[PDB]
Every structure is written in C-alpha cells, then in structure tokens.
Amino acid sequence: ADKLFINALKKKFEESPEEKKTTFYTLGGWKQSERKTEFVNAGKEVAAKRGIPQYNPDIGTPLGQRVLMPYQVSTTDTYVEGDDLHFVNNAAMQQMWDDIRRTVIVGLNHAHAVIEKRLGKEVTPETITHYLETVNHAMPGAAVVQEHMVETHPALVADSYVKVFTGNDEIADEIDPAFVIDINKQFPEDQAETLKAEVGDGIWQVVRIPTIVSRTCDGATTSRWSAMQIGMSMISAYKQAAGEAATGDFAYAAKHAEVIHMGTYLPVRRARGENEPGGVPFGYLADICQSSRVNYEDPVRVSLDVVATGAMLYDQIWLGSYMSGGVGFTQYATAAYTDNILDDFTYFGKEYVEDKYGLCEAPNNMDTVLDVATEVTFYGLEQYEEYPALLEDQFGGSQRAAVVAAAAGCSTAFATGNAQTGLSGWYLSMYLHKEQHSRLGFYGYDLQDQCGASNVFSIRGDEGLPLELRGPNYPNYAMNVGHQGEYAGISQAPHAARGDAFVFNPLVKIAFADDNLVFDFTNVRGEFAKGALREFEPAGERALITPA
Amino acid sequence: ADKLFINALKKKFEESPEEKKTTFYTLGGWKQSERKTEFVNAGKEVAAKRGIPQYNPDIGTPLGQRVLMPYQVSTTDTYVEGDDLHFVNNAAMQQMWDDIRRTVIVGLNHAHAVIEKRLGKEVTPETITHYLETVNHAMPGAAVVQEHMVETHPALVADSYVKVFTGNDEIADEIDPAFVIDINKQFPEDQAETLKAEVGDGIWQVVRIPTIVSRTCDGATTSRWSAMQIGMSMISAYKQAAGEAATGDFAYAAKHAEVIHMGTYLPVRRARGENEPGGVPFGYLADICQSSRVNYEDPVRVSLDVVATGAMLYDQIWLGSYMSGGVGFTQYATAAYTDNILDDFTYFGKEYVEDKYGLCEAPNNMDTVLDVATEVTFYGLEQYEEYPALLEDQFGGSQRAAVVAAAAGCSTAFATGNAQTGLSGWYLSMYLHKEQHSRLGFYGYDLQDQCGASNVFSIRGDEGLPLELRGPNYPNYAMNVGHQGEYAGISQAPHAARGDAFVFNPLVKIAFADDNLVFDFTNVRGEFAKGALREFEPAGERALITPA
Amino acid sequence: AQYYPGTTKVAQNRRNFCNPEYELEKLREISDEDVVKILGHRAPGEEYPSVHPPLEEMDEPEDAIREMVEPIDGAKAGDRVRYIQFTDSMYFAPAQPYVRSRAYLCRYRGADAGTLSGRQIIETRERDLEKISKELLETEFFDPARSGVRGKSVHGHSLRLDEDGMMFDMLRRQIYNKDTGRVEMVKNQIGDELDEPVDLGEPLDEETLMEKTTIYRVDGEAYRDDVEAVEIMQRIHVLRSQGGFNL
Amino acid sequence: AKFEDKVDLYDDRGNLVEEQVPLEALSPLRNPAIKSIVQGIKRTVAVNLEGIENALKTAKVGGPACKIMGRELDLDIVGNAESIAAAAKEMIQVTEDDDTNVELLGGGKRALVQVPSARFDVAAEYSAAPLVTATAFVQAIINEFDVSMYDANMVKAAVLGRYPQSVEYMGANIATMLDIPQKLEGPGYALRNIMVNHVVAATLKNTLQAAALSTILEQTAMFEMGDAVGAFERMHLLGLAYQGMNADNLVFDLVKANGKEGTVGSVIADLVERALEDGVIKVEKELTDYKVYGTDDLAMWNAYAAAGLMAATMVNQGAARAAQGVSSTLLYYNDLIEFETGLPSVDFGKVEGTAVGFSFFSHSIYGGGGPGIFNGNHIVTRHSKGFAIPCVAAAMALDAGTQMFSPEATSGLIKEVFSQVDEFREPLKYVVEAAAEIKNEI
Amino acid sequence: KTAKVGGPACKIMGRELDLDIVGNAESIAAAAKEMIQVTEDDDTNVELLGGGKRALVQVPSARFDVAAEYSAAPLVTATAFVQAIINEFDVSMYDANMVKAAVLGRYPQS
C-alpha cells in the first residue's frame, strides 16, 4: 500500500511522514538518547580510570538539537540507534570482515598431479579423506611430524578449518561429508547444475584460518598460513620425505599456481597485501553474499543484500577505517540498508521494468538507459519531496544520491541483463539528480560520477573494464563513499534477474555456501541487526587466556 | 658461581645437567603434559560443537617420547610449558604488537606554523591544551562539529589517546600534565638531558588509536585514523571553517610532512602498508623497548631485553605468522629469552671484554672482532658440550646458532662501541660454529650468514647500511628465523655500553616511555611471563557488545 | 686435493670422507633387497617408476654440454628422483651433516645434497640412489647406535643417549638387541614396519667412535685446539669482509 | 683502455672465434649486441590471439575460474588474424619505415610484436610495449567485427585482464619476458625479474646459450643498479666473460674434462690447478701438510672460480639430467673451494649464501618452488650480484623432465614467440660477433 | 658530522664523521665524474653550484640505452659520490657505511 519506508518514518518521529514542520532545541540534547547517555557515563569512567580526559559531550558542538533517530534495519523489525551500526560497536560487522579476510580457496589439482607424476603415488577419495582429517588437525595450528612442538590452544582457534568441493558428485560422495561443501544441498537445482558444470572434476579446498590470527596480523597472512599447513598435511598424509624437492612444488601450487585470494594487493599509496577490502572486486563481493541461493525468486532482495554487504564493508570498514578513521562513515552506509528506503525505490524500478519490458528483455542500449534510469531517478527524488520525514532521515546529499542511483542502476540492469548499461544508468541518475536539486553529494562525491559516463564503455588501459571486474582499486573509485557497495549491487542485479548462480567467480560463490562460517552470509542485514542488539557471538576472543 | 642456566636445567630433568644418558618412551606421550591434556580435551569439545574434526593427538607422530620441557622465562622465576609462549596463546605478546602497530608520532611544529602564518592566529601552551582536550575526545571516535553523528562506545576504545612531549621543560610545564610525557620523570638525568637536546623546542604528538580498530583493520590504518581526528580537532579548537583550503595543509602535515611511522611499507612480494613488523628497523625496535631507561647500569640486561622484544615480534609474529603461519616459530624465539642461557653467554662476554679492554675501549677493527667473537663463540659451544641437558634443551641447531652468535656479536659491540663490528662478530661466530660441530641451523639458516661477512662493510646500493638502519626488509634478512631479534640486540649493545639514551630515533624512545600503554615495555620478559600465566588483560575485547 | 686444514684426527677423518681415493671401511653386510626395504620407495621386485621417457627415446636439443656430460644410468632410464636421509648424534657419530654433503659431492655424480642440524639428505635417480645407499649403510658413514636413517621425525642429534647408548628416535626405527649386542632396523626410513628386520651389526665401542668421529668436542678433540683449522676459517672471514668493501 | 685485460672468445661448440678481445668490448655499456638484446626484450610482446578468442567466446576473463554469464562474444579472431594484425601494426608503428615488427605464428593463433624503439626513446621505462600492443589489438579487434560500444569492454578484459582493479595484468592474453615495474625488489631490478624458465624457453634448452642470455641480463642489471660502477666494474666484467661468455674456453674445457665420470669435487680440483697454472693464484703460506693460496688479483680469481661453478653445475646436474641439485652445487662448490684453497668463494660468499636459501626454498614448505620459477628479482635469489642465476638457467636447460613447473608449463607462450628472435635464442653468437666488431674501438 | 642519517629525527650516537666535503667538492666531483662517465668525451655532466654546496649531475645517456628504466641515474650517481668521498678522505672500511647512509638514506630497509 504504503511506501515500504513508511513504518520506519512513523517510528522515528511524532509527526506523520508528510508533515513539513517540527520542533527543535527542546529535546534535551544528548539526554534524549539512551545510547549517548551510556557513552557519557562511560566516558567519565574511562577518563577517571586512565587519568586522561576522553569522551565529553561538552567538547565542540552540542549533539541532539534535532531528534536523534532510530534506524530500522531493512527487511527486519529491529530498530536501533545509529551508534549500534558503527562497525566498532557491532561484532557482526567485524566478524563478516574477519570471515572474508581469513578465507582462501586452494586447488588440489596441481598437488594431486605432483603426487602421482613426481612421487609416483596414488590419490584416491580415501587418501583425500585422510589428508583432510590431517589438515583439520594441522590448520588451526597443531603439529603432525616433529617432536617437542608447541601448539595453539584448540579453543582459541575453533573457527579454523578446511573443507573441499567438487563438481563430481560421486567423488564428493566418497569423501567424509564433514569435510564437504555439498553443492546439491546448498543450492537450488538449476544453480547447482551450473556450479557443478563450472567446477567439473576439479577439487578445491576452502581454507579458513583463525580469526584471532587474522586480527593479530593481516589479510596477507591467510594464503601463507593456509599453504604452510597444507604443506605439512601433504607430507604427513602422502609419506614424502619431510622436506624434499617435491615439497617445493606443493608450496608453489598452494601459494601461487592454484590459489584464489579474496582480494589482490594494492598500489603503494594505499599499500596493502592480499585479502584486504580494497582488493575485493565487486563481482567477488556479490558472490560472497549468499542471498542468491536462498532468495532466487526475488532479484531485488538478492541485489539489495549485496548492497548491504558492500556498503558496510567498503564504506564503514574500508573507506571509513582502513582509508581514514575516526567517527567514520556509518550513516553514509546505513542509508543503503536501513528503513526499507532503497528497497522501495528498487521494487518500484523492478515493477516498472517488469511491466514495460519484462526482466532481461529490454534492448541493451542507451535508449533503455535513458528510459529506465530517468524514470527511477524521478521516482526516488519525488519521494524525498513528498515526504519531509524521509528527507530529514537521509539528510546528507551523498546518501540520497547513492540510494537513488543504486535503484536506477539496478533497475536498468534488470531490464538489459547487462551490468555495464546498469552502470551507465547509475551515472545518468547522478546528472539528473544534480540538476533537479542543484546539489548532489559532499565536496568530492562525484569525481567518479563526472568521469563516469565516458569511462563506462571506454576500452583504454586504466579505464576500460566490465563492472564485475571493477572494484575499490579501479582508479576513479579508489577514494569516495557512497559508490562501492552500490556498484556491487549493480553487478549482482542483471545476474539476479537472469537467475545466474554467480556473478564473477563460481568458486567464491561455493566457498561461502558454508554453514560452519561464523557470520551468516544468507542473511546479511539480519546479522547486522543481531550485532546491533549485542546478541552476535564473534570468534577470536581472548577470554580463555585472560583473567576472570 | 653457577652458570645462570643451571637451575632451569635442574627443573627440567631428573638427571644431573652433566649426565649423558636418560630414559625415553615411557613418559605417556602427551599425557605427561598438563597443557597438552588441556588441548586434547578442548579439541574434543571444539570438534563436537562444530561437527568437524579438529585437534587430535593421534594424527601424525606421537609427541612426548622425550620429556616435554618447562621453560623458565629469563630474569623471572616463572616456569611454563612452551605452548604458553606461543603468541596465539599469549595475550601479552599480542598486546605488545598492538601497542606498536597502533602508535604514530605526529609533529605539531608545521601545524602551528599553518595556524600562525596562514590563519593568522596565535598558538600558546593554553591553545595547545585546549586542542589536546579536544583531540582526546575525538581520537577514540567521537564527534566535535556535525549534528547527528554516531560514535564509538567510549569503553571499547578506552586505550586510545594523544599525548605530547617537548625538549623545552618550561613549555612542557605549561601544558596540562595529563597530556604530557614527562621526560624528566621517565628518564635518568643524563639520558633526559640528551633526549631533550635532541627534541629541542619541537612539540610532538604520540597518537595511539584503538586496539579494537587495529585488530579489525591493519597497521596502515594508524596514521590515517590519527590524521582524521587531528584534523577535526584543529578545526574545532582553532575556529577554522569546517573545511577550507587551510584544512588541506593540516592533512598533508599529519599524513606526510611530519609523521613518524613505526614501520615503512614493504615491496610487492611481501606487500604490506606502514606499521607492520617487517617495516620496523632494528634501531627503532631497540628504542621501543624501554629497558634502557630503567636498567641503565646493566648493558647486558638492556641488550637482552631488546633481543626478547625482537625475537618474539620478528620470529613469532612476523616470520611465524605474517610470513608463514601454523604451529610457527615459538621455540626458535624462546631460545633467546628462556632458561637464562643467552644471559649466561652474554654476561661471560661482557666480563671478558670489561676485563681485557674495558667497555667501549677496544679498537674498532677486525682484530677486536676476531678476538672477542671467537672467545665468546667457543665459550657458548663448550657449554652445550659440557652440559648434555643444555644441548637437549636447545635441541635445534638454529636456536644454538642464534644464541651463541648473539652473545658474540653483543660482546664485540660492548668492546668497540660500534654496532657494525658487532655484526661482523655475529657472522664470524656462525662460521666457527659450523666448522666446530659440522652443522649450523636449518636448511636455509645461513643465507644471510654466508653473505654476511662481505655485506657488513659494503657500501653498494642494496648492501651497504649501518646495522641500526637495517631491518626485516634488508634483502639478506627478509626470510629467515633466528636473526632479526638478535640483530636488534646487537644494535642496542654498543649504545647500552656507551650509556646512550637511544639507538636510532629519540622520538620513538620517548614515545614509548608512557605509563598509559597497555603493555609494559620496561619489563618485556616479565610481561611475556604474565601472559604465559594467563594473567595479562589486553585491550580491544568485544565482551561489552556480545552476549554474557 | 687437500680438502680440509687441520692436524687433529677429526680433521684427517673429514679429509678421508671427502677423498674419493680413500677406501671407506666396510663395517657391515647388507643385502640388495634390504637396502630397497630400508629406502621404502618401492617393493623388492617392483619395476622402477619413471618420471619421464628414456633419454634414447627423446629428441634432446643440439648441445655440446649434453654430448660431453655422461648421464647416470637412472637418468638414461628416466627414474624418479628419490632420497635417503641420515641423522648423526653429536655424541661422536662417525659422519656429521656438513661432512656428508661435502663428501657426497666429492664422491658421487648427479647428487643433490642438503645439510641441516638434525638431518642430512641426498636426492638422486632411484637406481643410482640404491647403489650409493649401500655404501652409506655398509661403511663407516654409519653407526647403528649413533646414526639413524630417518625420512621424517628426525629429532635426536642433540639429545642424550638412552641406557644402551642408542640415539633417541621418536619412531624407534632401530632397536638394540641386548641378547646379541646388535641393532636391527625394524621399520623403513619413513617409519613403516618391515616384514623382516635388517641386521645392522654391533655399535662401535667408545674407543673406535673416538678414532672415527668428525665432530669436534671438548671431551674429544676441541675445535679451538685445532689452531690451523681455526686460522683458515678466520682468514676466510677477513678476506670475505675486505672483498665486500673493495678490491 | 680502462682495463688491460683481454679474453679469447669461443662458440658453443668450443671453437675459437676471436682472440685477444679487450674486456670492455663485452661491457653492456659498449657492446652493441647487448644493447640490441636489452632493447629487444624491452619492446617485444607475445600476443595469444587464440586465448583472446576463447576468453571472449566463454566470457572467461579477469583471472582464474572467473566468468561473466551473459557476456559471451563469438568472434572469428584467429580466422581474421592477418587483417587484425595489420590494423594493429598501423597503430603500433610511429612511421611506415621504422623497426615495428608484427608477425603471425601458429597459423594466426599467436603474434610476435616488437614495438618501435622510437616509443622507448621518449619513455621513462618499458611498459609502453604491453600497453601500446594491448590497446592496438583491442582497437583492431573492435574495428574488425564492428563490436558495439556496449560489448567492447569485454574485448579489453580478454586482452589485458583485470587491470586496473588488479595491479598486474591478471588474466591477460599477452605476455612479456619482463614484469611490471611495481614488482621490482629495488630500483634497477627490471632486467632481473625474468623467470629462469623464460630464458630456457627462449634459448630452446641450449645449455650454453641459456647460461649466456642469463648472464647478459644479470650483469647488465648490475650496471643499472650501480653495482658495476667504480671499484667493482672489472669484477663484474670478468664475471660476465668467464662465467657466461665461456671466455678462454674455461667452462667448456672443465666440462669436457669432467663430463664422463666427474663430480663437483673433481671440477674444483681441475679449476684450482688451472688457476695455479695460469698464475692467478700462488701458494702464500705452508701450514701442516696444507697449502694456503693467495692472489694479487681477486677479480680474476673470482672469474676463474665462477667458470668452475658453471662447469660444476653442468657436470653435476648434467649427469642427473635433473635441475634440482643446482642449489646444492652452488652451495658446496663454494664451500669446498674455500677449504681447498684458503681463498674466498665466488662473490665473496654471496653465491654460497644465495644457494643456502635457494636450497631451503626449493626443498621446503615455506615458499619458492622448483629452480625454474626463480630469477634475480626473487627475494630468495637476488643476493648474489649476477653469479648464481646463470647456473640455474644452465641446470634447467639440462633437465630431462623431472620438474612439474617446467618451461613447458610456465613459459609456453614465451617459447613460441621469443625463440623466433635470433638474438634471444643465440645471444652468445651475436655478443661475440659485436665484441669483435668494436675490438679496436675500445 | 652529526650522524643524522636514515630519516626524520634519526641519529646514531657515536658514529659521527667530521669530513670537509664542501671544502673539497672540486676534487670529489671530479672523482665522481670519472666513475659516472662511460667514456671521456661523452655527455656526462657534473657541475658544482652554490660554492660546492650542491652539484648538478647528468648521467651519460649510454647507461640508459642499455637500461630497462631510469633508476640508474640516482644509483650510479650515489655510488660514485659515496666512493669518491671514501677515496678522498681515506674513510676506513669500518666507517664507510655511514657515508652510504648519508647519501642514499635508509635504502634498502626502506
């Protein structure tokens, strides 16, 4: 009936969403908020304990002259203060990143060829199972060969393990199911058929190293840690000399020749090793999100779960901490996953496309871009004009620009079945938005959006790239909030509409279809809400080795 | 009278330290050990809870056919099993790294020049104090300008703050003492005078960002997080426009023009940003350790406290996790800070030098290197031959090579007062050791030690460098255990003997003379022991925001 | 060739091990079949696996070096490259790690030798490995108490001996028989049980270990007391140091 | 005229080509053939037209296992290779009569491209070769089939991969012997980041040619790095001559004398005899039944020892027809020669050091791999200044098929294309010829 | 003179070397040029400025004709001046590494 955001707006304000006027200044400042009151009290205790002033509401300007809003986490009935969605205050958000950072995919195909060709030994579903029992002892940090080894405490590293998957059902059947990511169990029939065809008779490990290690160290640790314990377990299970020439072949295969990192390394100005957020391409992020395999009948839900995944990771943790820090960028991101606002805009666009073209049935050209992106942009902007509560909610121009353009781009991609024309729609939305309201985002919001139109279909060296392959290190995109997570959504959009099992990498898609992960990637926004309520239990805590 | 390691050997074994024979195989394997028994039970619980096999003492070969030893943490009376000194199992070791990783030093000279010359405003100790109260609200992640900001929970980020120091005593006295690192309080008279002369009228910030952020993100986050909140506090405290042209100068000053990183970024093959262990030069590591300012009358104690600091960080965390992983390199490192073994060897060398030359009174030449390094090497190796229990204790050749050469190199530096001839002694020790026992270390232990002699005094592009400037990224040193922490000790050695306040950077030395740090850098080995006993309370825990 | 400086028995023993014209003393008799069993790379009577075709069946490039360098028999046949690995007790074992690798590359063709503190390894074509391994097991390269054939779990070189004077072995691949005073190999080098144990003969007595050993020790001959050997090592250090600075 | 040294130059059959050649006629700074080889390697690119076509047909672009469903393009690229290559050359060339070369190979499945030297005369480095070639072929393919604005970005992905999201050309279907400048371990390292397998591929497993090309590249890098400046120049030039150029037929003759039954140890004995015979070393001191050798020319001793090192590798790894033991030869040749003579080993211990780590990182769990994947820019094998890697190239050339990561596996594209260039395939022949040409110009 | 080498605020106490470099700049520059040049008549340029406080160096183009990139310029220049300064004052093997640090900094650790 209502727009999907009406309940949220009603929960925020005393006024009806349509009302143009309100009352300020008499709300008690920070005292209106349970959370800010908790912070003020905490700041006093912290300062006293350590002998240095810390949090103090009297420093600078006085928060809370307007209503400090609750936010509904989209698709949930959970309403929380915005502070509960700051990544520092939300264990679910921290664990989502840890679960990606500590994952690598490592093939066994080169390794098995070394065993059979160089060593002259046999590989069977039986030897593989033995290897897997060995590596699941070894991977968390325990010994298999040497005498007088000291080891990691198993309870501190309980979240570390190794599983395998293959497209060959019979071989998968022969391996102990405790070690197997069952593609036929986790995916719907047509999707499972596609993924098994992509993988074929290949056998791949999904390695997850301990969260406590990932937090002590960095992302570039993951593929190295993985390789060391794969190496030990190959020695143990296949009876090599513990350190012969063939051992080097296994190292090179596991570290280089058949490894899939979640993120590639970054240039010097933003120097980082592998498996950091900036190296994760938009296509991978879409495939890490598991909404595709549970919500496949709803392409909007799938696309917007990917937007939530990316907005949090790319804006809050990556741009808001790795690349800057401080108070950071919580609400730049929450705009994309709260109050069912982006949902309303994107369901509108989906229905528009569905009624006019049919999904994936529009011509893949500029005519379609001009049609869909313009229509959806005008809808979104009209909602801010008709509902003053909505405009006061998403108060920053950057936040409105991202949300409107995300709906416009996803909807264009719903029509064409192609992410590149979806991207063209995103940029057109920005241009129309700017002229309509004589504003867009913050000072430097549209660096990429002004370069945008010309670089969508460019083929030049550092300009030309399918959107799925782009990411936070694509030059235009390397700096600014309110884009990266939304691009991940646009990457997902045409594939969700087409019913594709994956966006860019099928191995990555399968790798996170794993019930033994700590974070539930099938319900990203549900997890964010759980973290906001302080009900999420992360891995990597040191409680076992510290005083009571 | 007794060798310093004798009590430890008596605690480990029933036999007298000199006895050549013992009994094996009848100790019950892992069942002899309280810690391994804890691990076996924890592995059962972990596997049962998650549905995947994990720690299993019966995988591979059966640990504990010999005595699984307790280790005495050197200079303490604490005996623990080696597993308690694994960095994953030791919160003190993790917090030591976090305290280094989350620190930057940022000048206020430039910044104050911009305020006076470009904004045309005055800077006084009163304005600096107002700025410091502001930035100590802001740095942990709280707002000072915008309305409707969400913030970090003050209790989660209680370990984050900003202090300043200056060589000008009268100005330091005028800034509120809660924010000042008092050089005259923390350092002995002569050292205080040296450090204050080095800093002069300069004013420097020591910024520490939250441990929870450092663990969620990486080292390269630190100087960025620092700069954002320095920037906000400059705006607030000095009444800028919140975002004018001058704001860019403060950004460039805080991020580039006057920032001192703990570690510099690393090349692509071991790609990492700033403030990771590989970028920390040996001279900085010696200066981070605060033994110099408390144990200034015992140069051996100072040098070996630095070796403990470096062995743990460089071998256990850096080489043993960042650069590899798994069970890792606990005992490669513990050889340098347990059982008072390196202490015995190094006190011998110091007494030898003191008795023959006088500390820092030997000619700085090859004759002194040949004399001291040879004498000390022969002493150390004789102890392994005289005491079978000692040889069984430090069972790996790499561990003996590092310990013997560390004593030889430190002693040579005690004699010459110059780290470079100390380094030459280290390499000579290796060559003698190799010929004496027809073995040295592991397969690839002496890559750097064979290149060593020729590269000590080389002046060529990627070869020549004073030892103080060398670090984990010096090409020869980039790969292997049993060197880097010891080199940090040799860097400290001549300066400890000379009574120097610092080894390489006075700002780094002062920056860690701060009682508000979580880890106690004045007693590194005591802290390791506290962590081993599970008595250390780290920062960065998520208990406040998770289920009870 | 002079091989090594020094005037001790240790120094002479090191020279002897390296000198291909010095005939190693044979201490024990081991069958061809039992060498294959100890190696554990194939069963007795199993054909050598190949890693590539015979050289005579491949079209090798025109290459003067290929013409001048005669391939070992295992290379001609295309054998796998396999290994044998030894651990030597610091309590006066006859051979020691660097002594082995130096000697191997003086005595044997087509050899990949590796030195570590607790183990020493040679890798070469399988059928040639078997020939070399006979010599390594039968001669004074090996003592069945103070030395061990170990492909993994090598811990022991630095450990105290047991009551029988045997070196520690986590997998106990060599067992001392108190009834014979002889050592039997009960497992192959990777630790899998042998169908029938291999007689390795008696351990050398204390006096003979002293005569034959290549390790310097204070309770034997100390390295610091072989001044000519020490002098050459110090010379190497100085000349390397000067050379790195200038020429 | 800077140095007085002269060498005799031979071919790879051991025949004298040119006697009494001034040492500096072999310098990278002077020798026009070395200049031509270096400038050739900077400007040469292999293009896999078949790979591009298959990537497009399947939408498998941007790295391992990557695929974008719905983006498939069926283009007859190999079938129209002649027209596409001609169109590409028109964009790559500066003028119609310059040194641009574009040649189809494998029936059009592959292309050899040599970007004109004029483009490098006004370039800071070498990346113009892949980047100019990539965009010329992307544009040529788009123009050939009139690929729409909407689909053209797929052709770009098929050619150059995930760049610029990735720093490298991840998933690219072009290849060069050099890698991107960002991957340098230090300034001046670019000619060192050429995989050993690439060198062996380019020289078609001819042992002496592989050793030569490797030495030319390594020692030329030593000049760019500044290591061969001033005090050390002569040592580096003598190393190039004796280890890589077979000067005075020393390597060839040591191999001939020890090939039938020899070992590393017997090669050492012969080399020490030869050095003594030629007056390079003399007995400095007599100990107890032990002669301590000295020298008045450490650079020449180093050169002789380096030639022995190369010969010992060819004898030891040649006998095994298996490359893995080269790490052992590099270690123990140098370890043994020091205790045999009382003189420092090759590169004053640095070859031995490199060999220790190289052995470890080719027989352990921690990294590295087989001999063929190393190079002078690898963290494991960068430490010796030009004296270690040439032996690894020789060893891999002699390998009969024991390696999993062989040149066939890692360098197939390099082999087909770069081996077509005569001066890459037979570098020794050309450098010797050029040195004779400029003989009385030095 | 101050042993302040290797980056901002960095200093190694006890490593000070008192060398009259600017006073002997002409001799040092001539020695450096001899190492930087390939031949005598080539396009190498070494010119003193500011009374010997500064030097303009142009490394001969022949070095770049056989180089992959451009780093030969700072690296060749640095080592020529390091060697020239060492030779000028007969700096000992033990102290020469300080001259290297003063010219090129903390490379290669950085």
Ligand code: F43
């Ligand atoms: C498989 C290798 C080859 C390789 O790449 N790495 C190994 C194994 C690896 C594993 C052993 C864990 C396990 O048992 O599952 C780890 C812990 C690294 C990891 N993956 O976490 C390790 N070595 Ni190792 N490794 C060590 C050592 C050594 C010594 C042991 C000599 C002895 O007599 O016991 C020798 C080298 C030498 O001879 O010098 C050695 C060899 C080897 N090292 C041989 C196995 C030897 C064997 O078969 O028993 N390590 C040491 O010398 C001390 C420290 C110790 C490390 C663990 C720690 O620091 O606590 C460990 C460090």
Ligand SMILES: C[C@@H](OP(=O)(O)O)[C@H](NC(=O)CCCCCCS)C(=O)O
């Ligand atoms: C050599 C290199 O490995 P790669 O050959 O690149 O795979 C390197 N490893 C290491 O140096 C690991 C060092 C610590 C483990 C060995 C300690 S002795 C690295 O991962 O960058």
Ligand SMILES: O=S(=O)(O)CCS
């Ligand atoms: O005001 S600015 O656009 O510079 C920053 C927005 S957070």
Ligand SMILES: O=S(=O)(O)CCS
């Ligand atoms: O045996 S190796 O020297 O390769 C590894 C020692 S941990």
Ligand code: NA
């Ligand atoms: Na017989």
Ligand SMILES: [Zn+2]
């Ligand atoms: Zn971290």
